[PDB]
Write a protein that holds these residues in place. Structure first.
Motif, mmCIF file in Angstrom:
data_model
loop_
_atom_site.group_PDB
_atom_site.id
_atom_site.type_symbol
_atom_site.label_atom_id
_atom_site.label_comp_id
_atom_site.label_asym_id
_atom_site.label_seq_id
_atom_site.Cartn_x
_atom_site.Cartn_y
_atom_site.Cartn_z
ATOM 1 N N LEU C 88 38.034 19.839 46.773
ATOM 2 C CA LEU C 88 38.471 20.890 47.135
ATOM 3 C C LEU C 88 39.854 21.231 47.217
ATOM 4 C CD1 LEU C 88 37.806 23.301 49.770
ATOM 5 C CD2 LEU C 88 39.014 21.512 51.051
ATOM 6 N N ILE C 92 41.445 24.334 44.603
ATOM 7 C CA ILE C 92 42.318 25.135 44.922
ATOM 8 C C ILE C 92 43.973 25.048 43.807
ATOM 9 C CG2 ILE C 92 43.778 25.579 46.997
ATOM 10 C CD1 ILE C 92 41.944 24.508 49.069
ATOM 11 N N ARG G 68 36.416 46.221 33.020
ATOM 12 C CA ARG G 68 34.811 45.619 33.840
ATOM 13 C C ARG G 68 34.453 44.391 33.049
ATOM 14 N NH1 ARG G 68 33.325 42.949 38.206
ATOM 15 N NH2 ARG G 68 31.711 43.861 39.582
ATOM 16 N N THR G 88 45.809 38.015 34.475
ATOM 17 C CA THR G 88 45.434 39.675 35.965
ATOM 18 C C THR G 88 44.650 40.838 34.492
ATOM 19 O OG1 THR G 88 46.217 38.893 37.037
ATOM 20 C CG2 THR G 88 45.045 40.854 37.330
ATOM 21 N N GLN G 91 41.735 46.523 36.740
ATOM 22 C CA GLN G 91 40.336 47.576 37.083
ATOM 23 C C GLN G 91 39.239 46.026 36.649
ATOM 24 O OE1 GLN G 91 39.834 50.662 38.717
ATOM 25 N NE2 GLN G 91 42.312 49.596 39.304
ATOM 26 N N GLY G 93 38.163 44.102 38.777
ATOM 27 C CA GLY G 93 37.131 44.007 39.211
ATOM 28 C C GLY G 93 37.290 42.319 39.727
ATOM 29 N N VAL G 94 35.903 42.165 40.630
ATOM 30 C CA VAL G 94 35.581 40.287 40.799
ATOM 31 C C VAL G 94 34.337 40.164 40.118
ATOM 32 C CG1 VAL G 94 37.585 40.162 42.560
ATOM 33 C CG2 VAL G 94 34.623 41.090 42.797
ATOM 34 N N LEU H 6 28.083 41.768 54.961
ATOM 35 C CA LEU H 6 28.105 41.529 53.734
ATOM 36 C C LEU H 6 27.673 42.371 52.362
ATOM 37 C CD1 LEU H 6 25.310 37.977 54.410
ATOM 38 C CD2 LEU H 6 27.572 38.532 52.333
ATOM 39 N N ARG H 10 29.136 42.765 49.032
ATOM 40 C CA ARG H 10 28.522 43.366 47.828
ATOM 41 C C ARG H 10 29.121 44.626 47.541
ATOM 42 N NH1 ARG H 10 23.375 44.065 49.808
ATOM 43 N NH2 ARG H 10 23.827 42.763 51.683
ATOM 44 N N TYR H 12 31.522 46.593 47.422
ATOM 45 C CA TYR H 12 32.939 45.784 46.823
ATOM 46 C C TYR H 12 32.957 45.479 45.665
ATOM 47 C CZ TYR H 12 34.976 48.748 50.810
ATOM 48 O OH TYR H 12 35.281 50.176 51.571
ATOM 49 N N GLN H 13 32.683 44.179 45.877
ATOM 50 C CA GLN H 13 32.855 43.093 44.535
ATOM 51 C C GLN H 13 32.086 44.003 43.543
ATOM 52 O OE1 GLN H 13 30.768 39.699 45.997
ATOM 53 N NE2 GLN H 13 32.419 38.451 45.838
ATOM 54 N N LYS H 14 30.709 44.988 43.407
ATOM 55 C CA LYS H 14 30.841 45.289 42.334
ATOM 56 C C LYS H 14 31.604 46.615 42.327
ATOM 57 C CE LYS H 14 25.590 45.641 43.826
ATOM 58 N NZ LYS H 14 26.199 45.170 45.054
ATOM 59 N N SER H 15 32.511 46.890 42.307
ATOM 60 C CA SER H 15 34.299 47.682 42.395
ATOM 61 C C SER H 15 34.933 47.289 41.128
ATOM 62 C CB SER H 15 34.135 48.706 42.956
ATOM 63 O OG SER H 15 34.659 48.325 44.132
ATOM 64 N N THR H 16 35.927 47.841 41.380
ATOM 65 C CA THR H 16 37.592 47.573 40.884
ATOM 66 C C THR H 16 38.310 48.685 41.614
ATOM 67 O OG1 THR H 16 37.224 49.059 38.505
ATOM 68 C CG2 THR H 16 36.133 46.947 38.819
ATOM 69 N N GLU H 17 38.162 49.608 41.407
ATOM 70 C CA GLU H 17 38.924 51.047 42.684
ATOM 71 C C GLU H 17 40.037 49.769 43.835
ATOM 72 O OE1 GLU H 17 39.157 51.977 46.148
ATOM 73 O OE2 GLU H 17 37.370 50.465 46.609
ATOM 74 N N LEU H 18 41.039 50.433 43.620
ATOM 75 C CA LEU H 18 42.382 49.952 44.373
ATOM 76 C C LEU H 18 42.178 49.775 45.956
ATOM 77 C CD1 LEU H 18 45.566 50.789 42.464
ATOM 78 C CD2 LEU H 18 44.641 47.629 42.760
ATOM 79 N N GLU H 52 48.495 46.152 41.204
ATOM 80 C CA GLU H 52 46.577 45.692 40.379
ATOM 81 C C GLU H 52 47.256 44.292 41.387
ATOM 82 O OE1 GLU H 52 44.060 46.749 39.140
ATOM 83 O OE2 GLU H 52 44.845 48.772 38.046
ATOM 84 N N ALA H 53 48.648 43.685 40.497
ATOM 85 C CA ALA H 53 49.119 42.646 40.850
ATOM 86 C C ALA H 53 48.650 42.174 41.909
ATOM 87 C CB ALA H 53 50.153 42.179 40.378
ATOM 88 N N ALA H 56 44.816 41.695 43.121
ATOM 89 C CA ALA H 56 44.567 40.231 42.696
ATOM 90 C C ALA H 56 44.740 38.771 43.548
ATOM 91 C CB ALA H 56 45.016 40.390 41.243
ATOM 92 N N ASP H 64 40.656 31.397 48.354
ATOM 93 C CA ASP H 64 41.475 29.963 48.298
ATOM 94 C C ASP H 64 40.710 29.793 50.466
ATOM 95 O OD1 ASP H 64 41.204 29.561 46.336
ATOM 96 O OD2 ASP H 64 43.807 29.626 46.165
ATOM 97 N N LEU H 67 37.703 29.056 50.680
ATOM 98 C CA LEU H 67 36.808 28.002 50.777
ATOM 99 C C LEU H 67 37.385 26.908 51.668
ATOM 100 C CD1 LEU H 67 37.334 27.404 47.122
ATOM 101 C CD2 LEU H 67 35.456 28.147 48.593
#
Lengths: 94, 139, 97, 103, 78, 93, 98, 92
Positions: C88, C92, G68, G88, G91, G93-94, H6, H10, H12-18, H52-53, H56, H64, H67
């Motif tokens: 971990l 991290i 993306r 970074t 646009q 995403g993750v 959940l 899902r 919000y993880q599919k997207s990129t918009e701020l 954006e920074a 991110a 973290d 985790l």
DNA sequence: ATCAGAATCCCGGTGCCGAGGCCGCTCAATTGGTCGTAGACAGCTCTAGCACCGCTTAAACGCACGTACGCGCTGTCCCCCGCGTTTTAACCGCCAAGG
DNA sequence: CCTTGGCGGTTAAAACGCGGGGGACAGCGCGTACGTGCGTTTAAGCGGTGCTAGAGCTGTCTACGACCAATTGAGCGGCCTCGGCACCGGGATTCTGAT
């Protein structure tokens, strides 16, 4: 092999601040490495700034702003004070 | 340990160059070359030490070796003791192509091979060493 | 007599946060370094100072890692550091993906 | 000498030569090396002041790497500045966690 | 040669790090982590040495390799 | 003002790789940033090596060993092979 | 083959890279094959990235590459993400990870 | 409890918009910039890059924190997990 | 709480070997003068950044309600600590069997 | 008789077995804080128009730094001697766990 270092200057500064205190050789080596490191950081920042601003010259303005970028608030303030003082004292005379 | 050996070998390099310059001047001043003979014992003792070969190659002392082996402008060959000791040292060390490139000793070796005032035994040793050094280039 | 488990532990902690001497034996570390180096190029030397610097850096790294591991272990409300704590901490930090 | 004219102890000529031979800019102004030497002198004076204090605290008259490490890691601004450097024979600060202390 | 890092040495390193209790797998985990670290650092150092064409890795090669990682070390000629 | 960017070269490379694919403007901005960043990294490391070895010239050896330092194993191997191939053929031609 | 790119079989500009290496204050001198080598490496790396970005855009039934797909390509490649771990992407995403 | 969360994860993880509103963020940035030099102007792309920074950075920090919270055998993130994460990262 | 007794700090005398100081020299910084341009300065353009205003509506929010998860408490045990015994492998001396 | 190859020594953490305690881990129970849903207020967002500070560009003109050349002293290398400190045994504390 006549290789240069900062040992005598560090020793002079030490005797200027602490008269009754010596320094080991390993610590003098560490202080020389520290001086070289800080020099390299400042010169790299100054170079990057000069190249950003499209200038061929590294002047005292670049050095001052690199100091401001690198050091923390009070430390940067005191260092800028010292540098300005020294520059004006050197420029006033000749 | 080994940084110190490099410093000592560099000091030896400076001493050898200074002695060569002094002997060249003395010959130009009408005096025999004696400084090389004076420095010969220490150079021999250093070269005979095998574990210092790596530091010698890291300081490129072969450049000064070639400088000593280079005939002086008066067309006078170096002393036979110097030539013999340097040849023995060259045999005793693992010289590779990179070291020859750094030093350029092949030119002096070829000159020794072609010359006739050189001792015939030194001629044969020069031929052998040149062949050995050409061996890795072609395979 | 006998001490409570953890009293000699704290004595050792106090003793080792005071000293600065290298805690790994020199020859084992040299042999490990040569074993590792032999997998990239045969017939390498290292200067003794190169081994000394490597040992200093490796111990400093390991001590910092053990400090982070201790922080993680205390966070989990425990006292014994475990491999999952190390993983971990390294995740991290950004060392393991 | 240019160090005397500025009332300095660090060299101005050496620093100018290092800036000149370091491939940093086509030309180097004359007020940059003086300013940079002053900054370096200030920082080394601060470091040596705190290290001498730390060495006297241990009742020693000669600075060893341990005192440099203590001075660095004990000063917030310096420790933030030298955050990634490791000092050989510097050790660590004495630090025992609250929950590990005996009961 | 990785078994030369004995259990007492890892215990000593953990005690200077302030660790009070140690599991039994910590030793193997630490050996793996140290091996990875040393592998990276020695690889960089040997790359530098190959660029220099030297018969030794020098202390300068190690210092530049640590500066490359961001682990700047003072007191070895830097 | 004529601003310089690697956009046309990325189009060329893309058509070489994916003839039936297109790139957005923002993805081209990202690619330009990436190319500039990699150039900066490599040139800075080459300069650092040249200064470390008291050299005043950047030759293909410095660039090769910079690639060796920066790239990971397989990436380094393939990029070194590609660069040596290209340099060899440019020399030959 | 007039342009130096043609003489090396490249698509990136050898001359521009040469000018930037010279008018960039990196070293006193520059070789003749350093720009060629660097252009080759850069072209190879861009091709490497564009392959995976095209793959990701084709897995999403899309003809245009967007940030993306670049994010997906980078964060899905072990070596590229290690190279670009401290970068970074705007646009981007993750990655779906539950 | 735990399914719509959940689903939103899902989504919000599919997207990129701020995710932070643009004008409140602009006002925050101007307010913070008001200390270092009075009456500064900002490019729009500057504020976009800052957002954006920031997002991110915060997403990495929440990774973290998650985790650490899972490490503690929990599912709820608490401020001490954030503090531990920032400590290990080396943040001041 | 009190205690013996393991650990520790402390004191001091003894050695030493490295820090410090001092002579000799050489090379690089300093003085002197010369040129060319980088950049300071001014002046001009016009984009874009700030500024406001109106209108829409999705998002935020306040609130209610419930439950699941965090936290405290009990129990089990088992595996680390603390310890003594045994081991080992770098390099060494004394030994026996065949030529 | 000798050279030859061999077996037994010593030795400093380290390897190991062991007791047993305390800590990791599991189970349970409960209460609240957070998720979920719903009706309501907000201002972000969208769009519009206006004004203009200031950024980007251009052309001029000079002082500043680069460059040579001559010069000398500071900083280097060598080498010297003293004392700061390391080490050890004794003396004296002071914590540990046991009672």
């Amino acid at each position: 092999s006549r290789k240069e270092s900062y040992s005598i200057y560090v020793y002079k500064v030490l005797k200027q601040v602490h008269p009754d205190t010596g320094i080991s050789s390993k610590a003098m080596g560490i202080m020389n490495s520290f001086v070289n490191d800080i020099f390299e950081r400042i010169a790299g920042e100054a170079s990057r700034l000069a190249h950003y601003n499209k200038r061929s010259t590294i002047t005292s303005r670049e050095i001052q702003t690199a100091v401001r970028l690198l050091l923390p608030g009070e430390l940067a303030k005191h260092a800028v004070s010292e540098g300005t003082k020294a520059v004006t004292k050197y420029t006033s005379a000749k | 340990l080994e940084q110190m050996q490099d410093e000592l070998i560099q000091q030896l390099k400076l001493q050898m160059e200074e002695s060569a310059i002094r002997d060249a001047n003395n010959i130009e001043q009408g005096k025999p070359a004696i400084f090389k003979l004076k420095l010969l014992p220490k150079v021999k003792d250093i070269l005979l030490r095998a574990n210092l070969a790596d530091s010698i190659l890291d300081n490129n002392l072969l450049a000064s070796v070639r400088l000593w082996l280079e005939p002086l402008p008066d067309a006078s060959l170096p002393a036979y003791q110097i030539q013999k000791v340097l040849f023995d040292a060259i045999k005793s060390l693992p010289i590779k192509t990179s070291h020859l490139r750094e030093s350029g000793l092949g030119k002096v070796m070829v000159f020794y091979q072609k010359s006739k005032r050189v001792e015939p035994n030194l001629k044969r040793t020069a031929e052998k060493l040149i062949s050995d050094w050409t061996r890795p280039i072609m395979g | 007599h006998r001490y409570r488990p953890g009293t000699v532990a704290l004595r050792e902690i106090r003793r080792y946060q005071k000293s600065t001497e290298l805690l790994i034996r020199k020859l084992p570390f040299q042999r490990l370094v040569r074993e590792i180096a032999q997998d990239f190029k045969t017939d390498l030397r290292f200067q003794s100072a190169a081994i000394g610097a490597l040992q200093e850096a490796s111990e400093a790294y390991l001590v910092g890692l053990f400090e982070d591991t201790n922080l993680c272990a205390i966070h989990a409300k425990r006292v014994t550091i475990m491999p999952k704590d190390i993983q971990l901490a390294r995740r991290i930090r950004g060392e393991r993906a | 000498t240019r160090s005397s004219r500025a009332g300095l102890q660090f060299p101005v000529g050496r620093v100018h030569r290092l800036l000149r031979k370091g491939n940093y800019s086509e030309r180097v102004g004359a007020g940059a090396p003086v300013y940079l030497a002053a900054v370096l002198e200030y920082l080394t004076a601060e470091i040596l002041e705190l290290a001498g204090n730390a060495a006297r605290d241990n009742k020693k008259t000669r600075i060893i790497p341990r005192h440099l490490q203590l001075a660095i890691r004990n000063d917030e601004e310096l420790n933030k500045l030298l955050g990634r450097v490791t000092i050989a024979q510097g050790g660590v600060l004495p630090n025992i966690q609250a929950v590990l202390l005996p009961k | 040669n990785i078994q030369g890092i004995t259990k007492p040495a890892i215990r000593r390193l953990a005690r200077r790090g302030g660790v009070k209790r140690i599991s039994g797998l910590i030793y193997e985990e630490t050996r793996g982590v140290l091996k990875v670290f040393l592998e990276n650092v020695i690889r960089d150092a040997v790359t530098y040495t190959e660029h220099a064409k030297r018969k030794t890795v020098t202390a300068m090669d190690v210092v530049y390799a640590l500066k490359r990682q961001g682990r700047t070390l003072y007191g070895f000629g830097g």
